[PDB]
Amino acid sequence: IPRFNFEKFAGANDRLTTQMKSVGEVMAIGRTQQESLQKALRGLEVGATGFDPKVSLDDPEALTKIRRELKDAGADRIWYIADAFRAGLSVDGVFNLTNIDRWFLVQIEELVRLEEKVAEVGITGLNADFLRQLKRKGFADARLAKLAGVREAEIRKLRDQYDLHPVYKRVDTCAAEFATDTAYMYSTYEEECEANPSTDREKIMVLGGGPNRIGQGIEFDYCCVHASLALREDGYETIMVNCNPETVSTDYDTSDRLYFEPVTLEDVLEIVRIEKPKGVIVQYGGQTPLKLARALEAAGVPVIGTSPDAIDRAEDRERFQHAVERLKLKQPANATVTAIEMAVEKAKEIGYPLVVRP
Amino acid sequence: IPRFNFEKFAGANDRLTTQMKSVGEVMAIGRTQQESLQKALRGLEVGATGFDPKVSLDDPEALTKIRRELKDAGADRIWYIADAFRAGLSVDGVFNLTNIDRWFLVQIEELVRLEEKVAEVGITGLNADFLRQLKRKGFADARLAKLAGVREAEIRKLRDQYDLHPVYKRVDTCAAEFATDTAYMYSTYEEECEANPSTDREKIMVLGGGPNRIGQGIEFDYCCVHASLALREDGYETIMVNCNPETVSTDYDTSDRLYFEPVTLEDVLEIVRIEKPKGVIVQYGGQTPLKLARALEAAGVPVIGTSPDAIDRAEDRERFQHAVERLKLKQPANATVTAIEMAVEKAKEIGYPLVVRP
Amino acid sequence: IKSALLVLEDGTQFHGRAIGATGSAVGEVVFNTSMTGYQEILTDPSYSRQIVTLTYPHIGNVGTNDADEESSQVHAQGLVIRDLPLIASNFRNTEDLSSYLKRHNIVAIADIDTRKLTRLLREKGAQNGCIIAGDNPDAALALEKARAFPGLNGMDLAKEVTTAEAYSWTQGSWTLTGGLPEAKKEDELPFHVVAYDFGAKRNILRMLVDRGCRLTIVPAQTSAEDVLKMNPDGIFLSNGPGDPAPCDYAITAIQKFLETDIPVFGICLGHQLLALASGAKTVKMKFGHHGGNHPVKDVEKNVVMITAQNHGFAVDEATLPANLRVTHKSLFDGTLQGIHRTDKPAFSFQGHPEASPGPHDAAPLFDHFIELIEQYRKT
Amino acid sequence: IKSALLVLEDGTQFHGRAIGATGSAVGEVVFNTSMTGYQEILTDPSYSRQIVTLTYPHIGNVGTNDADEESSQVHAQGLVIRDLPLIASNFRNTEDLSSYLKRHNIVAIADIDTRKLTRLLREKGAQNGCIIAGDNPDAALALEKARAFPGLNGMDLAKEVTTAEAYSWTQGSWTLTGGLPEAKKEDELPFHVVAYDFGAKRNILRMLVDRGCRLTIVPAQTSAEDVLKMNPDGIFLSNGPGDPAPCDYAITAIQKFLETDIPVFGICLGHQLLALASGAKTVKMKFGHHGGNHPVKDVEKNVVMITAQNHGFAVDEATLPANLRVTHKSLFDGTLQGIHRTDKPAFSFQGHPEASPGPHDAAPLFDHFIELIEQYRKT
Ligand SMILES: [Cl-]
Ligand SMILES: [Cl-]
Ligand SMILES: [Cl-]
Ligand SMILES: [Cl-]
Ligand SMILES: [Cl-]
Ligand SMILES: [Cl-]
Ligand SMILES: [K+]
Ligand SMILES: [K+]
Ligand SMILES: [K+]
Ligand SMILES: [K+]
């Protein structure tokens, strides 16, 4: 799945054509197309958890937008396809507009249908059997929590309850015809696990930043690789978690164990669950892994290096100001406004020119 | 199917509710529901030949309009249902909006699908087998002609070629379990014909006005009934063609023979074809039969009473103005304006107040 | 394209489409006027060896469901309809008609002029026929098989569908709310009736149960003796396929019960049997009665009831023995519909008081039976 | 919920969904790495008595079509896949996989951990197994069936799939544009080759015809004498199921041919038979070769070809007679893939030069056959 950055280019034409406009891409592996696709969406780093809706069901105009979005593809098309199915459109209808093979479309419609049942039955209808079937389709805990009206952590606890965890398969070029000594894996909901984690060494896990986008390029990946190379050389068993296909970080040669997965809380926790690393590094992959720190720590993950709290202190405009204050350092005059008329006054205080940060 | 007249009440609420707003109704008989519905459509007298489109395929807002028409039923819903299927909405999506049983909906969908093939294959694709299939589903020659991009008479010719004519079945209250001496018939594309026309008497055909509407009411049907009662009494064999379930015209008692059929050129020609009447009266059913007169004659029907030409003379404002002129009679001053500024002038000529007639 | 063809004895061919199993079917051809109830009809044993034609064009609108099965299987030799709906649309549907047919291995044809077919049978009387559904239906062959059909006249079909071994039935009628109920416990049923199975419709049994009867289903050929031994509060003679005439065993037995004081009630084939055992004569009707809008008058009360009919043979009114009074007649053709023994507690009805499908109008016929029973116990 | 279950001899169970016929299937279980060509695979007679597992998860993406049938029927005893796609999506499709399966009455299961199964087969070697598709499939009983399977080792399956009577083959290969051709005319094909049907794949014949060969397909058990009588330009030995070893009749016959100067070419089973006939031995492999990406070296030319493989037995290279020279070896495991007689106009290939499905890399193997034939005719 390609990664775009149209928001940064307000006045740009955002319809997809023959001239590339994507700034990067994510890759995913699944035992089935549905599983593969869903995993790819949740690793895209756009805030999606799968097929999150774009338009409201009770929007009178909804069909008009959906139609537009389908006929003239934008970056969001994938999501408008599912919205289309939620709105009553048919696979043939969608086909006629998009030209995307029905083989793919039927799979998306089916997922929408399952989402509709989840919404309906609620968390209460999330029985072991059904939950399993949904996981097997690539459904993220977060997506399922949205539909059921719960916290992601609730679905996760529920899986824990049913002992519903993925298994890991390995890439081997030959469809298992030959054995592999390499550890290049992906998760899935199947029977046999081929992870076979070592009990031998001290493990260090490095979290990558998924697809590249403006602000989050190859620079973060370079650091992730260096970490792996250095510690491995140092004698640690290095574990890389990433899903950017363009990078060296996803080259099997770069780490002792590579998990080609979505850099999400769900995905990472499952790996940590069986690897039981000594430490996890979250400061090298850019924003993506950084935004996971606090939840990882919360879940018991052994996060190494500068703490999530220390990170937060800096990243928190208020915690920070306090510290600078404390250190007796210089900072430009600043205020936190709520209302317009508030700003103008405060602005008076602060003095023009001004830096207005959302 | 009910008959409405909302165009006559501009400021009125045109949505269907629990308070009746219809001004009349049409009825149709068919061996199948498809056949039955299409015949009724074509007999409604609103210019439909069946499921004629209401919205453009290539209209960006089409889905939005359709949706609305479905959700909040108006007089045109039935056509909008077909448009919905053409536009890519599924049977379930349509159900959800309209609550009309899927049993009916799938039927309409199949008809659309059939129309799309017709559009694709064109007139060349109209082999006997297919054409016959189409006829069996009640498709009108006019509908097929529009899809095929031909003249209605071309389809009719095509049918004559293939020898593809309808058969007549009779109404008998018992599903053919008992014989009947009454000749209350309806057309259908089947094997066995039950018309059994007389060779015996001179027949007179009377065309009805179809459903009642504002302006074309019971008054026209009363005349139709009297023509039949008089001539029948006079010894002719009286054949009535009408599909208004409310009227005395459609009472088996009123005539010798009753064809409960749409009053259209196609349907009428078929009856004529086999009855070979002595004359046809088109002067008593209102506008309906009147508009058919020319075509009927052209096609060789023995129209009696005032000639279609004669009728046209009167109805054509041009022809008329000459006849008044011809006779040295008085008529209000009139003009035929094309442009605005042409009228303003002409109007100065004519003098206010003015009677603008489209 | 999946062809199917139906050929009648006279050589009349109807070409259409296959909607059931691949294969051939041979039977007497009949027409049924029932606008609803196709499933119950199909599962009616009385239709054994018969090719069923339904006059109502759209057959299958509501799908199928186990509750709508009158027997353990499909008895109809074949099915002839005008149109098979695209979908089944009813909350009770568990399987579409076509799927159902296939599963029961029934040869069925759709898309034929059923009307023409119906008028032919009415006009010229019943005919034997054959339906062939497959890649290249052979007309000649079809004609062959039709022609070769033995015919239902003199055919004892009752022995063919009857139960192998006796059994007990204690199940009541379905309710919208409760569906088909749980079989009652013997101690719950007041009377004990012995039912001869001549290809019995489950609704007859169920409605008997509703009246407080515990049943004992017995094979057709069961001996009066063996029966008497059971100490029945009543004896019931069920409906069934074929000619009632050739069923000597039953006739003989019935005669035996008639010497007793035990109440006897026969429905349809059992009506014919009763009649025969009383010295009456049965005939084969032109086309018979198959539908559910049949008016029948209770001559006694001078009241009409709309009934469910399904018969090819009737009892000759003109040959009735004096001990056999007439209780009901058809308003359609005047044919014999009911009779009661002047001297015994035995009566019968040609139609189907149990309907299924059909108007409930004739249900009270059961009621009389109960009376007889209750009064027989009093003594 | 339509259950299905696969149980191996070792007792390993795979719980899934039934996607084909109801019932049971028993045979040796194998894995095939072919990401495409499933239909061709299923209709391969070499797969008789084998339960086929496909490694690629989505099986049935492009539905099915006649043109994609390698023989009259589906010979695979059963089919095992990870996922049966919601729809078929290809212009060429005429029937979805499930329907087709059901049509050919095949027991097949979907939704199982095909990877687990593959790994098991690769690690522990081939195993016999049983699939049960039904309401409540019995594991125990499946296990017994799998344990009771006699095993392919030493099993003559050729005599089982062969043709009753001999026939003529004159049809060429399919084309995108034209599709399958119309049978050529006998006077259109320069050569006349006699082909032994050990369960021959259509493509093999079609491709021979493309090269100008008019075929006479004979029953496996055909005498060399009966054959020679035909004055063949050449003899071809087809592919087939089971152990080549137990096919005495053919080895013997071939031996005869080898005394002559007629050109002989064998493919697969026929390769094996040719080796046996020359005094070589065959062995049954661990799990064998089944897929379409197998690298095979032409030792003579030092070039590699990606080939189509489907064999459980192989010719031992170490037992090769001096009159047998090695022409090809697998790059995957080093096993024997081709041989030529040093003293006679005879050679064979273990892979499948005709592919279908698979890479076309090996089709030139055919050309060499033709040279032998033209040169034989010169003489
Ligand atoms: Cl731009
Ligand atoms: Cl569930
Ligand atoms: Cl328009
Ligand atoms: Cl066609
Ligand atoms: Cl017909
Ligand atoms: Cl499994
Ligand atoms: K990237
Ligand atoms: K009206
Ligand atoms: K027909
Ligand atoms: K499973």
What 3 state SS string does C118-171 have?
HHHHHHHCCEEEEEEECCCCCHHHHHHHHHCCCCCCCCECHHHHCCCCCEEECC
Helix residue ranges per DSSP H, chain B: 33-43, 62-71, 77-86, 91-98, 102-121, 128-136, 141-148, 152-162, 218-233, 265-275, 287-298, 308-315, 317-327, 340-350
Using the Cα atoms of residue B242, residue B246, residue B252 and residue B253 in order, give the sign of their dihedral. negative
Helix, strand, coil: what percent of chain C each, to 5?
A: 25, 30, 45
Is D294 in the active site? no
D76 and D51 in contact (C-beta within 8 Å)? yes
What is the rounded distance in angstroms from the CA atom of residue B77 to the CA atom of residue B298?
A: 35
β-partners of residue C296 are C305, C330
Q: Which of C263, C329, C275 is nearest to C302 (CA)?
A: C329
In a shared domain, residues B168 and B227? no
- Calculate how far, in angstroms, residue B36's C-alpha sits from the geometric centre of ligand 9: 18
Closest-CA residue to A240 (of A218, A217, A219, A223): A223
Q: Which helix (H) or strand (E) holds D14?
A: strand D13-18
As given in the structure block, the two tokens for residue C72 are 């353990």
- Identify any residues that bridge with C15 across adjacent strands, giving them in sequence order: C5
- Same domain? For C21 and C83 the reply is yes
Amino acid at C92: R
Task: Kindly state whether residues C160 and C129 are assigned to the same domain.
Answer: no
Which of 290-329 (A) contact D at CB < 8 A?
A: none
Compute how many other C-beta atoms are within 10 angstroms of the C-beta atom of residue A262. Answer: 26
The answer on A113 and A167 residing in a single domain is: yes
Q: What's the rounded Cα separation, in Å, for the pair D48 and C12?
A: 48
The interface residues of chain A toward chain D in range 149-178, judged by CB-CB distance below 8 A, are 169, 174-178
Tally: H helices and E strands in chain B: 14, 8
Contact C119 B176 (CB under 8 A): yes
Nearest to A189 by CA among A152, A138, A113, A140: A138
Backbone phi, then psi, for B270, in 5-degree steps? Answer: -65, -35
Give the SS3 label for residue C351.
Answer: coil
**Tokens matching residue A47:** 């805030």
One domain, residues C6 and C139: yes
Query: Among D268, D290, D294, D340, which one carries the catalytic annotation?
Result: D268
Q: Which CATH number does the domain housing residue D60 bear? A: 3.50.30.20
The DSSP string of C170-196 is -----BTTTBSPPPPPGGG-SEEEEEE
For ligand 10, the distance from its centroid to the CA atom of residue A29, given in whole angstroms, is: 19
Q: Residue B247 corresponds to which tokens in the numbers above? A: 């009227």
Contact D254, D277 (CB under 8 A): yes
Q: Point out the residue among B101, B177, B179 whose CB comes nearest to the CB of C89.
A: B101
Residue where a domain stops, chosen among C95, C127, C150? C150
Query: Which are the residues after which chain C is interrupted (C to N > 2.5 Å)?
Result: none
Return the number of CB contacts < 8 Å for A and B: 41
Please indicate, yes or no, whether residues C210 and C334 belong to a single structural domain of this protein: yes
Asked if C257 contacts C348 with a C-beta cutoff of 8 angstroms, the reply is no
The tally of domains found in chain D comes to 2
D84 shares a domain with D230: no
Binding residue ranges of B: 357
Cβ-Cβ contacts under 8 Å, C119 against chain B: 176, 192
- Which residues are CB-contacts of C311 (< 8 A; sequence separation ≥ 6)? C46, C268, C285, C288, C289, C290, C350
Q: Calculate how far, in angstroms, residue D148's C-alpha sits from the geometric centre of ligand 10.
A: 25
Q: Using the Cα atoms of residue B87, residue B91, residue B95 and residue B98 in order, give the sign of their dihedral.
A: positive
Distance, in Å, from the CA atom of A130 to the CA atom of A121, rounded to the nearest integer, reads: 11
Asked if B191 and C116 come within 8 Å (Cβ–Cβ), the reply is yes
- Separation CA D114–CA A35 (nearest Å): 16
Q: Is the peptide bond before C353 cis (omega within 30 degrees of 0)?
A: no
B200 and B167, same domain (yes or no):
no
CB atoms within 10 A of CB A317: 11
C288 phi and psi angles, rounded to 5 deg: 85, -165
Question: In which residue are the tokens 């006796």 written?
Answer: C166
Count of CB atoms situated within 10 Å of the CB of A222? 14
Q: What single DSSP character describes residue A125?
A: G
How far is D25 from D22, CA to CA, in rounded Å?
10
How far off is chain C from B186, nearest CA to CA, in Å? 13
Whether D75 is catalytic is: no
3-state helix, strand, coil in chain B (%, to 5): 45, 10, 45
Residues B143 and B174 grouped into a single domain: yes
Contact C122 B192 (CB under 8 A): no
Q: Per the residue annotation, which of C268, C271, C311, C328 is the catalytic one?
A: C268
Q: Which segments of D117-271 are extended strands (E)?
A: 127-133, 167-169, 191-197, 213-219, 234-237, 264-267
Which of C150, C169, C199 is the last residue before a domain boundary?
C150
Please give the residue range of the domain that contains residue A60.
46-195
Same domain, B191 and B202: no
C324 and C284 assigned to the same domain: yes
Please say whether the beta carbons of B306 and B275 come within 8 A. no
Could you give the CA distance from residue A237 to residue D51 in angstroms, rounded to a whole number? 42
Nearest to D170 by CA among D154, D183, D157, D187: D183
Q: Do chains D and C touch (3 or more CB pairs under 8 A)?
A: no
CB of C48 closer than 8 Å to CB of C99: no
Q: Are residues B202 and B186 in the same domain?
A: no
Protein residues placing their CB within 5 Å of the ion ligand 1: A 12-13
Say yes or no: C116 and C165 in one domain.
Answer: no
Instruction: Determine whether the interchain pair A90/B94 forms a contact, defined as Cβ–Cβ distance below 8 Å.
Output: no
The structure tokens listed for C208 are: 């008997």
| 3-state SS class at A75 | coil
Q: Do D10 and D130 lie in a common domain?
A: yes
From the CA of C289, how far away is ligand 9's center (Å)? 26
Chains contacting B (3 or more CB pairs within 8 Å): A, C
Of B31, B106, B191, the CB nearest to C57: B31
Handedness of CA D122, D126, D131, D137 (dihedral sign): negative
Q: What share of chain D is helix, strand, coil (3-state, %, to 5)?
A: 25, 30, 45
How many CB atoms are located within 10 Å of the residue B200 CB? 7
Q: Are residues D94 and D25 in the same domain?
A: yes
Closest CA to A106 of A92, A87, A88, A120: A92
Nearest Cα to Cα of residue D119 among B134, A172, A330: A172
Decide if B248 contacts B254 (C-beta within 8 A).
Answer: yes
* Domain extent at residue D64: 1-150
Distance CA B23, CA B3 (A): 6
Do C183 and C275 belong together in one domain?
yes
| Residue D339 near residue D315 (C-beta atoms within 8 A) | yes
Ligand nearest to the CA of B114: 4
Structure tokens at B95: 């159900």
Residue D251 CB contacts under 8 Å (≥ 6 apart), including other chains: D273, D276, D277
d(C-alpha A106, C-alpha A91), whole Å: 6
Kind of pairing, strands D282-298 and D303-315? antiparallel
Among C34, C87, C91, the strongest candidate for a mutation testing the B interface, having the largest count of B CBs within 10 A, is: C87
- Whole-angstrom distance, CA of residue C39 vs CA of residue C75: 11
Residues D257 and D264 sit within 8 Å (Cβ to Cβ):
yes
Residue A161, C-beta contacts closer than 8 angstroms, at least 6 positions apart: none
Q: How far apart are CA A220 and CA A205, in angstroms?
A: 15
Distance from the first to the final alpha carbon of chain A: 29
Chains D and B share 3 or more Cβ pairs within 8 Å: no
Give the C-alpha separation, A29 to A170, whole Å: 10
Query: For residue B68, what is the nearest residue in chain A, using CA coordinates?
Result: A60
From edge to edge, which strands make up the β-sheet containing D282-298? D167-169, D213-219, D191-197, D234-237, D264-267, D346-349, D336-341, D324-330, D282-298, D303-315
φ, ψ dihedrals at A263, nearest 5°: -85, 75
CATH of the domain at B59: 1.10.1030.10
Binding site of B for ATP, by residue number, is 357
> In chain D, how long is the greatest CA-to-CA distance?
68
Cis peptide bond upstream of A353, omega within 30: yes
Q: CA–CA separation, A66 vs B62, rounded Å?
A: 12
CB atoms within 10 A of CB C182: 10
Considering only the beta carbons, identify the residue of A106, A110, A191 that sits closest to D113: A191
Token representation of residue D208: 């021979």
A202 touches A237 (CB < 8 A)? yes
Q: Can you tell me the distance from the alpha carbon of B336 to that of C79, in angstroms, rounded to the nearest whole number?
A: 67
Task: Please state, in angstroms and rounded to a whole number, the distance separating the CA atoms of residues B49 and C342.
Answer: 67
For A239, other C-beta atoms within 10 Å of its C-beta total: 25
Angle at C103 between CA A107 and CA C166, to 5 degrees: 140
Residue type, B320: F
The set of residues, in sequence order, having a beta carbon less than 8 Å from that of C42 and lying 6+ positions away, is C52, C74, C75, C76, C79, C106
Shared domain check, D320 and D180: yes
In terms of Cα–Cα distance, which of B78, B74, B66, B147 is closest to B113? B147
Tell me if D171 sits within 8 A of D181, measured CB to CB: yes
Chain-chain contact of A90 with B89 (C-beta, under 8 angstroms):
yes
**Position B100, amino acid:** I
Neighbours of A225 (CB within 10 A): 23
Contacts of B250 (CB under 8 A, 6+ apart): B27, B208, B240, B242, B243, B244, B258, B260
Geometric angle at alpha carbon D103, from D99 and D104, rounded to 5°: 125
Across the interface, of B60, B90, B92, the residue whose CB is closest to A67 is: B60
How many Å lie between the centroid of ligand 1 and the Cα of residue A221? 29
What does chain D come to in residues? 379
Tell me the C-alpha distance between C1 and C18, whole Å: 9
**In whole angstroms, what is the distance from residue D29 CA to residue D9 CA?**
10
User: Which positions in chain A touch D118 (Cβ < 8 Å)?
Assistant: 175-177
Residues C333 and C231 placed together within one structural domain of the fold: yes
d(CA D263, CA D268): 17
Using alpha carbons, select from A229, A284, A237 the residue that is nearest to residue A257.
A237
- A64 vs B63, B92, B96: nearest CB: B63
Give the CATH number of the domain where residue C159 resides.
Answer: 3.40.50.880
Nearest to A109 by CA among A120, A127, A93, A121: A93
Would you give the DSSP letter of residue D58? B
Kind of pairing between the strands at C264-267 and C282-298: unpaired
Q: How far apart are CA B42 and CA C156, in angstroms?
A: 54
Cα B306 from Cα B283, distance rounded (Å): 8
3-class state of residue D178 by DSSP: coil
| A42–chain D nearest CA distance, Å | 22
Q: Give the span between the Cα atoms of A138 and A136, in whole angstroms.
A: 5
Burial zone of C315 (CB within 10 Å; 0-12 exposed, 13-18 middle, 19+ buried): buried
Does the active-site annotation cover D58? no
Q: Are A290 and A237 within one domain?
A: yes
Q: Nearest residue of C to residue B174 by CA position?
A: C33
Of the candidates B61, B64, B93, the beta carbon closest to that of A88 is on B93
CA distance D248 to D264: 18
- Are B180 and B206 found together in one domain? no
Nearest-CA residue of chain C relative to B109? C86
CA dist C270 and C236 (Å) reads 8
Cβ contact (<8 Å) for A67 and B90?
A: no
* C179 vs C251: CA distance, rounded Å: 37
Same domain (yes/no): A243, A204:
yes
* Cα D234 to Cα C140: distance, rounded to the nearest angstrom: 48
State the nearest Cα–Cα gap between B93 and chain A, in angstroms. Answer: 4
Residue A25 φ then ψ, to 5°:
-165, 155
* One-letter amino acid for residue D84 of the chain: L
CA separation for the pair C299, A31 (Å, rounded): 76
CA-based nearest distance A1→chain D, Å: 20
Residue D140 φ/ψ, nearest 5 degrees: -60, -40
Phi-psi sector, C152: left (phi>0), alpha (psi -120 to 50), beta:
alpha
From its phi and psi, is residue C76 left (phi > 0), alpha (psi between -120 and 50) or beta? beta
Q: After which residues is chain A broken (C to N over 2.5 A)?
A: none
The strand pair at B257-260 and B184-188 is best described as parallel
Cβ atoms C247, C273 nearer than 8 A: yes
In three-state secondary structure terms, A10 is coil
B316 contact partners, CB below 8 Å, separation of at least 6? none
Closest CA to C261 of C280, C234, C279: C234
Helix (H) or strand (E) holding C257: helix C248-257
Q: List the strands of the sheet with B257-260, edge to edge.
A: B167-170, B184-188, B257-260, B237-242, B203-207, B279-281
Q: Hey, what long-range contacts does A157-165 have (CB within 8 A, 24 or more apart)?
A: A158/A123, A158/A126, A158/A131, A159/A131, A159/A135, A162/A128, A162/A131, A162/A132, A164/A128, A164/A131, A164/A132, A164/A135, A164/A189, A165/A270, A165/A273
CA distance C371 to C366: 9
Q: Which helix (DSSP H) or strand (DSSP E) does residue A206 occupy?
A: strand A203-207
**CA distances to C92, D244, D251 from D269, in Å:** 57, 6, 11
Give the end of a domain, one of C109, C126, C150.
C150
In the block, tokens 């979908």 appear at C87
